[PDB]
Amino acid sequence: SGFRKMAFPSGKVEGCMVQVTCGTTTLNGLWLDDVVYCPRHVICTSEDMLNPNYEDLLIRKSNHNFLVQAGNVQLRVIGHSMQNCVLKLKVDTANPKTPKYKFVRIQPGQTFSVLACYNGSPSGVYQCAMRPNFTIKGSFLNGSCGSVGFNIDYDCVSFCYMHHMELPTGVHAGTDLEGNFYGPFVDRQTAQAAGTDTTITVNVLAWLYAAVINGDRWFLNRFTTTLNDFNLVAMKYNYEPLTQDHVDILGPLSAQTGIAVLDMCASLKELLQNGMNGRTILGSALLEDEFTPFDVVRQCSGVTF
Amino acid sequence: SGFRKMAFPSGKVEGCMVQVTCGTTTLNGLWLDDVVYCPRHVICTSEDMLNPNYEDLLIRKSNHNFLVQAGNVQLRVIGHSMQNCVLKLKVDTANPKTPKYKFVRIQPGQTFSVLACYNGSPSGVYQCAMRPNFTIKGSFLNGSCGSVGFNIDYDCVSFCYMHHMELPTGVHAGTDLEGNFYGPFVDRQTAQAAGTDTTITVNVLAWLYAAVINGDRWFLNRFTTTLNDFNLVAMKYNYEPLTQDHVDILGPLSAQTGIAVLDMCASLKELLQNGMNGRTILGSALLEDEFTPFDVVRQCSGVTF
Ligand SMILES: *C(=N)[C@@H]1C[C@H]2C[C@H](NC2=O)C(=O)NCC(C)(C)[C@H](NC(=O)OCc2ccccc2)C(=O)N2C[C@H]3[C@@H]([C@H]2C(=O)N1)C3(C)C
Ligand SMILES: *C(=N)[C@@H]1C[C@H]2C[C@H](NC2=O)C(=O)NCC(C)(C)[C@H](NC(=O)OCc2ccccc2)C(=O)N2C[C@H]3[C@@H]([C@H]2C(=O)N1)C3(C)C
């Protein structure tokens, strides 16, 4: 037993990380087959970043201006192109460590692992959620851009995130691997602000199911509710509305525990209205919303890759 | 910015994981050079585990009784021996993926990454502390034993933990890689209990320094204290006594922030006596003690491997 915020094993992604330098700017790239994907702001001077014209800036860049290094060894760049907010650098060598992979654009409320990198070298791994407001709560410094987020389904790596920037509240914005931002963010150093940080209601319920599976049971009550009744409470606390689709996704955890989703909603309602009275659930003194139903089942059943 | 519970990249360890079966029992092993290390209770029937005589049980086991599988391929066992609570299986092939490695017995209050495995296959990665009471708060199911804990110093993997068992409170006990338990635990299914779960005081202070570095500053106060004065408060709250050695280890974080360790102790004292008044620090509503000073510096400076 026990329940931890748990990342995917990072080895398959570590083998894809490279360093990309253009002029004096160095960040990370992802090497898959004969392509290196990296944030297009590698071509910018610090000054360019205030108001960049990326197409105009790219005119001045040739293949040889892109220095790509895989550990200690230089890759030869034989082509380049911009797709949305990412550059694709064609190199003369297919990455021999390329795993089975897909590009996916994840939905808000889904989780993924981040392999934080600097100079093409991995620093660490942690789990994040795509928040309803299309930000993530990461850990990123100067040089981290091009660090990616991913999921693994047995042998297949689904890349869903590439790191580009930080907003106030120290939250993080970036793109899918087609270079399209999550949310309304742009890759320019100008005032941008995150919207309301809504709580992922279905994830809080999944985590309450994890707590029950682990014998943390004190918050189970004698009450039930309805979707509409619960949602009137959700709304006051900036929780996402719960739908029948959410109830259906919680079906495995409801079946394993014998607790109806609406009974668990009645427990959640009491926790939102009364707080936790200085008690903990799975060692937390707040309600956790960065575990998906699938994360709880994966962790509680010991699914491997 | 941002501050996350962050594991080491797991790739170097993933390449060392194998499956070990003896009779009907399957667990994980660690393959380094031509040796596979695994928990000795692989040789036990469920019934044996109530009161095992490991030397007597091992008489009945030969090299061929140890089925070792590295992904899909069988390793040939050419020798076996018991060292404390681990078996060492000599195989006819040196692991071609062996990293630069050391075995270290960590001190209580130090952190490490766990690569949770089942059937020799990685499930996930998370960060743990060796708690003062010589347990860890992990996430382990049936089949997880032989999962290891480690640190990386640039290219060198320091293995410090091998998973053996679960105690009440759903906490975890195991050995160093010489097969010596942390704490007084034995590898027998008989009533054993964890001692008092003391808080790692130096780690809480390190995390308060991380919060300041991140602009979470509300808890800084107008007060200072002394070691002896602070420690009279520590003791009531089951905090480890703070020593000058702890103060010296916090020197980098004190110097970076300009906040004297004793001033931060005065802030900690107010938080212990008054609580957090429903406020958060780095998104937590409790004081976090599983980041070491070195973890905070590593994360806040972007150290790579
Ligand atoms: C990638 N290597 C880098 C990522 C990190 C820099 C650091 N945290 C990161 O995630 C950080 O301090 N980032 C904040 C700054 C100001 C540097 C901007 N953010 C930004 O401009 O957001 C809009 C804003 C502007 C002014 C005030 C408030 C909000 C930032 O992250 N970046 C500016 C520049 C690149 C990016 C960056 O440094 N990425 C791009 C957006 C092109
Ligand atoms: C390794 N494959 C396995 C690890 C896991 C089993 C699971 N969690 C684990 O970490 C679990 O439920 N473990 C608890 C049980 C009861 C199975 C024992 N713990 C134990 O005996 O602790 C002492 C105790 C006895 C009775 C009541 C209270 C405490 C346990 O973990 N194991 C029994 C047997 C191996 C180990 C195990 O299953 N490891 C060994 C200790 C030889």
XYZ file of C-alpha atoms in Angstrom, chain B residues 158-304:
147
model
C 24.701 5.428 -5.551
C 22.319 2.559 -4.679
C 21.204 2.910 -1.031
C 17.928 0.911 -0.716
C 16.352 -2.444 -1.667
C 12.617 -2.898 -0.859
C 11.674 -5.846 1.436
C 8.479 -5.209 3.429
C 5.529 -3.106 4.689
C 4.727 -2.217 8.357
C 1.440 -0.878 9.826
C 0.721 2.793 8.913
C 1.532 1.504 5.340
C 5.242 2.460 5.681
C 8.135 0.564 4.150
C 11.328 -1.134 5.378
C 14.269 -2.569 3.487
C 17.996 -2.953 3.261
C 21.102 -1.311 1.870
C 22.696 -3.282 -1.047
C 24.813 -5.330 1.474
C 21.449 -6.714 2.691
C 21.538 -4.948 6.127
C 18.109 -3.555 7.194
C 17.672 0.120 7.940
C 16.387 0.072 11.547
C 15.646 -3.027 13.659
C 13.320 -4.762 11.112
C 13.642 -8.429 10.134
C 12.410 -10.182 6.955
C 9.802 -12.325 8.726
C 5.986 -11.938 8.730
C 5.658 -11.290 12.466
C 4.338 -8.235 14.340
C 6.854 -5.354 14.005
C 6.088 -1.674 14.616
C 7.746 1.612 13.549
C 8.953 3.938 16.352
C 7.962 7.630 16.680
C 7.924 9.367 13.266
C 10.227 12.319 14.125
C 10.270 15.323 11.701
C 13.588 16.062 9.896
C 14.061 19.648 11.240
C 17.022 20.603 8.928
C 14.904 19.499 5.900
C 11.889 21.679 6.967
C 14.301 24.679 7.197
C 15.790 23.837 3.772
C 12.220 23.809 2.316
C 11.389 27.137 4.019
C 14.533 28.494 2.202
C 13.126 27.030 -1.123
C 9.831 28.887 -0.410
C 11.712 32.198 0.094
C 13.757 31.625 -3.118
C 10.324 31.153 -4.825
C 8.789 34.367 -3.346
C 6.546 32.554 -0.773
C 7.603 34.940 2.061
C 4.513 35.480 4.289
C 5.865 33.329 7.193
C 9.128 35.384 7.623
C 8.798 37.253 10.981
C 10.554 39.997 13.072
C 11.965 37.385 15.538
C 15.130 35.339 16.155
C 15.895 32.500 18.593
C 18.797 30.337 19.845
C 19.527 26.642 19.128
C 18.659 25.696 22.743
C 15.482 27.863 22.685
C 14.310 26.496 19.298
C 15.119 22.888 20.407
C 12.847 23.266 23.515
C 10.048 23.952 20.898
C 11.300 21.231 18.453
C 11.008 18.614 21.264
C 7.254 19.270 21.959
C 6.444 18.739 18.205
C 8.620 15.580 17.761
C 11.191 17.497 15.655
C 14.841 16.231 15.580
C 17.172 18.450 17.620
C 19.006 21.016 15.460
C 22.857 21.106 15.832
C 25.618 23.459 14.545
C 26.408 20.748 11.879
C 22.805 21.299 10.527
C 23.321 25.124 10.624
C 26.597 24.668 8.643
C 24.897 22.445 5.992
C 22.208 25.219 5.593
C 25.084 27.741 4.926
C 24.570 27.842 1.106
C 20.804 28.582 1.487
C 21.403 31.148 4.331
C 24.050 32.896 2.136
C 21.845 32.883 -1.038
C 18.834 34.407 0.848
C 20.597 36.622 3.452
C 18.395 34.983 6.173
C 20.346 33.646 9.186
C 19.416 30.018 10.083
C 18.413 31.165 13.630
C 15.995 33.800 12.127
C 14.474 31.031 9.971
C 14.234 28.864 13.166
C 12.199 31.729 14.752
C 9.836 31.597 11.707
C 9.592 27.779 12.023
C 8.858 28.171 15.807
C 5.887 30.507 15.011
C 4.569 28.030 12.362
C 4.797 25.106 14.893
C 3.116 27.095 17.714
C 0.462 28.956 15.581
C -0.040 26.640 12.580
C -0.445 28.018 9.059
C -3.876 29.679 9.642
C -5.176 27.966 6.426
C -2.290 29.484 4.318
C 0.067 27.395 2.092
C 3.858 27.279 1.518
C 4.933 26.013 -1.939
C 1.287 24.790 -2.327
C 1.467 22.646 0.868
C -0.740 23.097 4.002
C 1.796 21.103 6.136
C 5.550 21.607 6.785
C 7.496 19.369 4.294
C 10.539 17.500 5.629
C 11.510 15.255 2.629
C 13.730 17.837 0.853
C 17.422 17.933 2.004
C 19.481 21.162 1.778
C 21.238 19.523 -1.217
C 17.798 18.766 -2.861
C 16.834 22.469 -2.580
C 20.205 23.713 -4.047
C 20.092 20.962 -6.801
C 16.536 21.936 -7.830
C 16.974 25.752 -7.470
C 20.371 25.746 -9.447
C 19.383 23.135 -12.181
C 22.183 20.529 -11.489
C 22.222 17.765 -14.250
